[PDB]
Design a protein around this ligand. Sequence first.
Ligand SMILES: [Zn+2]
Ligand SMILES: [Zn+2]
Lengths: 258, 66, 87, 457
Amino acid sequence: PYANQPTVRITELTDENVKFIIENTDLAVANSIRRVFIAEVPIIAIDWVQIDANSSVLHDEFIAHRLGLIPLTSDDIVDKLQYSRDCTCEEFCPECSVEFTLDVRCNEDQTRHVTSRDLISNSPRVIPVTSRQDDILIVKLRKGQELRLRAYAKKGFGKEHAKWNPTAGVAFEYDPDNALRHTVYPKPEEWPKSEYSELDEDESQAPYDPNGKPERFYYNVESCGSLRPETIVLSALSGLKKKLSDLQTQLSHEIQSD
Amino acid sequence: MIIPVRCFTCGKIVGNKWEAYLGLLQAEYTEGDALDALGLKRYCCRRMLLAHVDLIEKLLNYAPLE
Amino acid sequence: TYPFDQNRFVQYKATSLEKQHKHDLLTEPDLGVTIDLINPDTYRIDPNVLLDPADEKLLEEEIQRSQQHAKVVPWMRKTEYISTEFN
Amino acid sequence: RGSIEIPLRDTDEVIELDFDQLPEGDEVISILKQEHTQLHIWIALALEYYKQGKTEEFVKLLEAARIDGNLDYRDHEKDQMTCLDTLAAYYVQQARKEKNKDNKKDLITQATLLYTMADKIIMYDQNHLLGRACFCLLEGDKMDQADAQFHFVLNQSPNNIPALLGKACISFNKKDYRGALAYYKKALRTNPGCPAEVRLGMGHCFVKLNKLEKARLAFSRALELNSKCVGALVGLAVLELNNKEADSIKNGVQLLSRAYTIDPSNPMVLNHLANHFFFKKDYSKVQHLALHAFHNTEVEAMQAESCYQLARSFHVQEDYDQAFQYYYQATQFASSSFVLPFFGLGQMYIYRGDKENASQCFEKVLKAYPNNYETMKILGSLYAASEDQEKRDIAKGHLKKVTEQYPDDVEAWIELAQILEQTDIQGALSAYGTATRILQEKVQADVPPEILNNVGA
Ligand SMILES: [Zn+2]
Ligand SMILES: [Zn+2]
């Protein structure tokens, strides 16, 4: 009547992605973990942009939008900072935000590329990923054009806006050989073998396993660089566990208060 | 107009690859080997660089001053 | 019963099996290299140090694939960007 | 080089001794002791005699050097310990290449006696741990102890490459080629002086894990540095002798006749020449080389193969009595080497009606991998009669292997129907139906009455 005992194996771990397999577990748990990787791991992203002078060929909302999508190296500080919505201070403060400045003017003939290398943080640990390869282009400037702005980054979920999504792409796969026949190929031989297919090159798909359950889940969590790829997973497990703990607290209060 | 910062479909930063892409094409990498060498695997990331039209280079032909 | 022939000889060309056998190189228990530190009377590394490319490739363990993006295909082409000067 | 100046009692270095002659090593000890030369000249001439290619004089002249350690040399014990290190290291090196008049223990007791006296002056030095580490390889046990003694040379003073190569042979003995290959990389960048072609052991580990592109590149360079080494040539033979299908003249001449003419006392090349000639139907030389390929080897890997070759040569001659004992020695020496000796004893136990043990010895053939030939072995020597699913199940599973492939199946369907007459009667009928026509394509031969009888039954 109780939980299953999940187990893990990391098959590959780079500074870009983790591949790992979760065994036992349940399809719903594995997919909700996938979702939390996508949508409810927090990262730091630019979410406030006060443009003082812009004369680039891109209008301010376009500049601001691009700054939003620049990933920031919030591998640690995201677990420290409050959500600004929750911080008790009238403006941004270093306990709920990281200030950024961009101050660039193209005083030369060669077309100046404004890049994430020009976003100067007020915190040496929350810097755009490409600062710690090439830098993300924010604008190309002609002679005499300028862009001066300051921005604040803040913690947010990928659920709020995609700027805060930490993953490049979560590969997620289970039952690589279709032993469960949860997918039903009209012609099982036209389909290439999965990366994790255990079958030989003779047979097309595993024999139907009637009592089977989906019980190994193959992940590839690729980071956009805002967190280390193993930190995405640990943070998603922490986040989902915390969501459930909060739900349980509210439940216990609703039960005892009836 | 300019290169999108993230691949719309997945999320991979492609906004730091355009000048690299073009430099690899100038090394006369074939057009898919440039993408294989930048590290774009998913066709969703590859269509960010293949399809991108870099119009900002034309917009910068117009002078505000000088 | 059918009087099946007793397999008392090799009619089968089982030499298909004997020639495939990879006999291990066990000429010396030290893997054909004498373990000692007194015999090295001479030394290669004298300032004209020797470095053959055939020896340079054996320094790596495994470094050495497909190129199927490049394939020539008459229903497919290439692409075109924004220059500054054109027609 | 060619001569050394001699410290004399009077008028030192006015006179010299040269090493182009082969003088007697008995008088050397006297002259070194009347002239009262220093201990350094002793090792100097030891090295010069080692340059001549003389392992015996090098170890015998240095034996009397222990008595004259510090007579009047004014505290020259360091050169004494450096002298005795050679008598504590070259004994184990020469115990492996024993002759026909001496045994292994005769050099082990001498490598164990003087090593304790070597550690009296200086203990735990750059080479003293090498002696303790290689002592375990000579008895065939305590591999972790030898590895732990080899690791200590990195923490004291690792001023040479073979100071670390000792761990790779111990990683090799535990079937760890990754850990040995990672240790053999440092052997090629430095490349110190060693006549044994240190690159040869690195080409040995490129054999495994599908690195044929690397092992050839190692053996070729070892052949170009010195063609005298057979271990770089016979290895190419063991690469090539599989290709008995084209250019076989290269395998017989370039890789078997050359290694033999340059070094005929090798049982590996003798075994390979033997099996090369077996296919050539030259049995008069196979057993002579296999007899010479048997008495000189020590590790059971080569002698079990030599007895397998001898029993194979006697089997084809309708001589199973001597081949039974050679097959038994081939499996008693090295059983987990290959499937061949188990198959040889399986085909042998058929003789004298002792086909009971042919089934037990054939059982270990399937454990490695099945064969289209081994399936018919136990199918023919099938003791399954009736209501006996311990042996009929194996007959069925062997028949399912002969049924798919077509190695000129003639009696396979007979053995099919011979089991299926207890099971569904239609399977036996289908088997006799196909067996009836399969007996007509080779010749115009009528169907024997026994099959038409069993089918009518
Ligand atoms: Zn705050
Ligand atoms: Zn993408």
